[PDB]
Symmetry: D2
Subunit: 198 residues, 4 copies
């Protein structure tokens, strides 16, 4: 079975950057949608695998990636956010940011960059490229997962799907994206960071 | 130059199905975004064509389709909607619907079908397949145009991009999709229809 | 376990249309490659499913579709070919061809059409669209299966991957495509046809 | 007008690695195909741009990228190959290879890696990522150009489209890929390299 994470703060705790109406729905109506369909599909995909049924296995695949990836994209997100989060990453992570984007503000535009240009629905990502032992920004389509689709390890991800900001910023994706920095829980983005080791 | 169509009714005129806050923004902040970037890109793409510069031509391509298709997808949409629109297509169009989906409610389910399943951002489409002289439902990704990407002729399209319903239906795409029928200006969907001739 | 079909004729039996060097390799070196990797992957995909491991499940997906689809695309192919095959489809199938493409020669160009324009590697397909009870030509990318990716039922498929003709027609895909008609086992393309029933 | 480059050696000059039957056809029948269709399409695309005809512009797009990118992918290729080419990149380029893949054999494996895994038709690429001032291996689909589609600068590319090796290595892509090293004209791959400057 797969289950919906409780988010590490109330809905309320990310005001004013992200309002609680958006957190209310992102977690409960949105993320829960994916977990449940992940479950129905994975269910169906251990049945069809078992029969060796390669066309219904291939047919259950976009379903599996949308909800699969939609479950794990949004599960990393809540953790990347926190009220006593925010500011700039201390220590090691910061230094890697410095070593790879030149400076934290250069790193910040480079990620607003990726995120603000997702044509349609998708995500912006600060990832880790462990074959090259460095940071790496990537943007992903729909709920297409960073590691499931590129092999890069997710440290920080930004949802730019309209359901993530619209009820608040309306058409202005980059306003959302500016608010977002203030709740970025660098203490966890670092934990993910450290996990990766050279 | 490309210019933003005025929509054929005030924002207000599609209440309660689509509220005027949504119409206000879809036309003004959203569609206008695409026209203007269409223009900057087409500008740049007659410069680079002129230099025979095939890599910057290929680079301006997703930009051109997003805003190109985003301009023409949304320009057909306003025309497919009207207050004294709605109900059931009379005459010829209805009959083709009957001949191709069996009945208008079978046709309606088949198009909610397409639309409600757009993984991510995209559109549901009642099109015309002129190589086979019949109707044809198609769903398109992002602002990927029906005829620019499939050759099918657009008669009726439904935006299922979240920016089309979210401020009102929130996570409930199919509620939007049920409201939508009541403003469907069949008189124009028919005009597009007739244009196609066998 | 998945196993390689024996092909229903010797390599030799499709001369001169397709030479036996090509049949030798298509079946033995090519198709067998896919079956074996289908097996290793499906193996790995019942392990990771079992652990509920959604990122390695999503990572095994292009592997599964390439070899999955590559196994079932090529398994339908051999059956669509035969020496005492060829000519035009008798009875019902022919009539559906007449009803959907106007005539067998109109149907033949419409399928050379699809096949000859596969940008890169892929397949041309005479399929069945069972939601609309009619024939339907479709072209698929790489070893992307007709029914696994579109829901259409495969009656006749043409490989236009270069490995299918190159050792013989070299750069001339459409020469291959003309030869191909002469070995088209219409007796089986019909059996697939009939299976579909309205 | 666009014109076919003469290749910098006779067909013959890359034996035994790539045979002259393959060079004969790659340059003459294959690359020439793309130049000519580039030309017809670019022609049509300055007509339709001129009329502001956004759906026929979007329709001429896959045509333009296939032949556009197919023209420029194959034009860089001939230059990356030479008889008095081969071996090990001297100086600066070598050092960047050392700095980015650890060693030239690690770099070689990493690029056979990319190339040998192109599902279907495509290319493996040693590129330059000028926003990060370093080397970067990328693999591209069909004739999808490195810089036109990723912004990375092409220094060395390997065609793994079957038309590049099949008449010689048949199903064995990696044999082709091993032969390939021996004709790699490092003197030019370096010139492209140096052009990029930090
Ligand atoms: Mn989301
Ligand atoms: Mn819209
Ligand atoms: Mn094949
Ligand atoms: Mn080539």
């Amino acid at each position: 079975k797969h289950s919906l994470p409780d988010l590490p703060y109330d809905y309320g705790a990310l005001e004013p950057h992200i309002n609680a109406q958006i957190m209310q729905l992102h977690h409960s109506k949105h993320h829960a949608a994916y977990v449940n369909n992940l479950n129905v599909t994975e269910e169906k995909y251990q049945e069809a695998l078992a029969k060796g049924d390669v066309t219904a296995q291939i047919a259950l695949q976009p379903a599996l990636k949308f909800n699969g990836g939609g479950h794990i994209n949004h599960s990393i997100f809540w953790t990347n956010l926190s009220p006593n989060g925010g500011g700039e990453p201390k220590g090691e992570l910061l230094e890697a940011i410095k070593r790879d984007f030149g400076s934290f503000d250069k790193f910040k535009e480079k990620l607003t960059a990726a995120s603000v240009g997702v044509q349609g629905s998708g995500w912006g990502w600060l990832g880790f490229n462990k074959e090259r032992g460095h940071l790496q920004i990537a943007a992903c389509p729909n709920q297409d997962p960073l590691q499931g689709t590129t092999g890069l390890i997710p440290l920080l991800g930004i949802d730019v799907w309209e359901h993530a900001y619209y009820l608040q910023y309306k058409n202005v994706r980059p306003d959302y994206l500016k608010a977002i920095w203030n709740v970025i829980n660098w203490e966890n983005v670092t934990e993910r960071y450290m996990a990766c080791k050279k």
